[PDB]
Amino acid sequence: MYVYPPRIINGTLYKSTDLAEYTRGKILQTLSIVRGELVADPFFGVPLRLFSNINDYQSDVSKIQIILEEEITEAQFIVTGDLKNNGIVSLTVYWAYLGTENIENFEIDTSNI
């Protein structure tokens, strides 16, 4: 299968047999698409709220967690939000691939692109 980020490696599209990095690519694709980006599906994508005071900053985290859980059924998602110094809201998505039982390392990460 073709993982989300289109990279031409060795003259062809990067095809991966493993389902674990394919699931990771699915997570990256879901998080990289803002709701409304796609013309076919105007509802798929994470909701983005950028310029607003940091009072209700957990509800969007919960919405992102729910969207990740509904869209990707092969992984379990826990999303946490931290408040940084200037204006940064740090989201951390803890995901585990249900097919595997241990942490699965990918060799394409070590390769220098």
Place this chain on the structure above:
Amino acid sequence: TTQEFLSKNKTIESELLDLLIKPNTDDSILTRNKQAIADRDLFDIEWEPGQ
């Protein structure tokens, strides 16, 4: 009386039995496990001592 026959190239009567060898995959000891299950229902586990 005996009829004489000379070499031909392609007859309909030979094409009635041109079929002789069939490479099928029907129930047999070598075709029991036709269906394999993908990773959607498999767990990848490591082999530990005492396993």
